Amino acid sequence: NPESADLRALAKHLYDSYIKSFPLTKAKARAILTGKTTDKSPFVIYDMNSLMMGEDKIKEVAIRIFQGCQFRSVEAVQEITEYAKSIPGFVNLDLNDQVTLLKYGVHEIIYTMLASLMNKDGVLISEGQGFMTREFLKSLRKPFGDFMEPKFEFAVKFNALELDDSDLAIFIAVIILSGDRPGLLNVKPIEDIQDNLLQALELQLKLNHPESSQLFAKLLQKMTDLRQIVTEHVQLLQVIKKTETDMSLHPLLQEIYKDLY
């Protein structure tokens, strides 16, 4: 169709902006995860002894570990915000609608990019200098022990789709421009940008994955999977905040979490 060339231009623009916004790309995470790097190997946290061992690079241990994730999530919100501002039309949206889209979208993007840092054995932590084993995460007291298992299963399935950074840039842009987020004031312009991003994604996958049958449909289904993951994420902070009252929360996270209560 007449828009196909412009859809490749938009695809390239989002890929360039993604490289600009996200230091730790899938390509870098896979290189680290397969020792195809001249970086130093990452430290491996697999037990209580090895976590203390690696203390220098991060109450009750399970809480300290999950509280520790706040620094990475604050950096990720900043990166995602920079990326969102590069999406054509985004900065012209109602500023309150831009806040809403970031508030309801960031965790879905964090779990998406986390899949890039995961294999069936464990997850890259501390900007890629640490590897924390699935097994070690499985061993934390309930409910923490059960929490990451379904995240690892999502990742293995997501990673089996063999998406690259070019694919992911457009996928993430589609998720940001979700017109069904609670409290959006003007949904039409958001769905108009999303519709064009979906056309750009559909064409990206057809050209970049020509033998990957229904890859577009499978990717839309992953966006559904990511919303369930975020519901479970929020349900855990909710459960622990019933017993642990004095818990620290970075102001920026306080804003993202407000009203999900």
């Binding site: 919100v77 831009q98 804003e255 993202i256």
Partner: peptide, 10 residues
């Protein structure tokens, strides 16, 4: 006082 707004406007 929105921290997301401050990030959005920078």
């Amino acid at each position: 006082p929105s921290l997301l707004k401050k990030l959005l406007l920078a």
